[PDB]
Ligand SMILES: Nc1ncnc2c1ncn2[C@@H]1O[C@H](COP(=O)(O)OP(=O)(O)O)[C@@H](O)[C@H]1O
């Protein structure tokens with residue numbers, strides 16, 4: 001499957017934070033959207049997800065323009081989303097966190113939802129934390145729970161907004177592995193970070209954004225030799 005955003009633009013108080021941004025992610029690849037803080041990465045994700053209204057642009061899947069679909073209908077079309085800020089229910093156990101999102105799986109019985117919850121905990125290596133409250137988890141464990149939550153809906157595409165934010169150096173490795181596992185599973189993965197070199201390593205290719213503009217696209221090696229890129233990090 002192919003997910004495409006075309007000519008996205010968004011302004012707050014007239015200030016252009018995203019201008020003419022176009023990108024694509026396909027099933028079974030990891031695509032980066034990388035750039036400094038305030039560059040417009042989250043705003044772009046919001047427009048793809050349907051969280052904020054666009055001033056301009058189109059969101060499309062295959063031969064289907066879905067720009068007019070609300071967030072809930074876009075999710076049902078297979079777009080999943082991991083927010084930058086914490087999204088875990090802090091007072092709820094890891095298990096209750098998953099069961100809560102699995103309630104949207106109208107295709108499953110109540111007992112198949114529990115099966116799925118157990119499968120997800122095993123897949124994300126959090127099954128030993130079944131009854132731990134979200135509040136008591138490390139950043140790395142929290143993130144594994146939040147990513148599991150995002151997959152409960154069964155998306156074809158997952159937008160990961162700074163999945164490494166707030167996670168210790170060590171837990172970063174398992175998350176990277178899980179992301180690679182998602183891609184191998186056939187999901188299209190789109191991922192943001194301000195740490196270019198750290199996240200670049202996990203992408204097949206990446207768009208670089210600065211002050212609302214797309215300034216380059218390429219593989220990791222291409223990006224790291226790109227004059228327009230260097231020009232931003234002089
Ligand atoms: N509701 C809002 N009103 C005004 N400015 C905003 C609003 N939301 C975000 N911004 C600004 O837009 C810019 C881009 O934000 P964002 O997309 O979060 O960048 P990134 O995610 O790459 O750090 C930031 O400078 C931010 O302060």
Ligand SMILES: [Mg+2]
Pocket residue numbers: 041042043084161
């Ligand atoms: Mg952001």
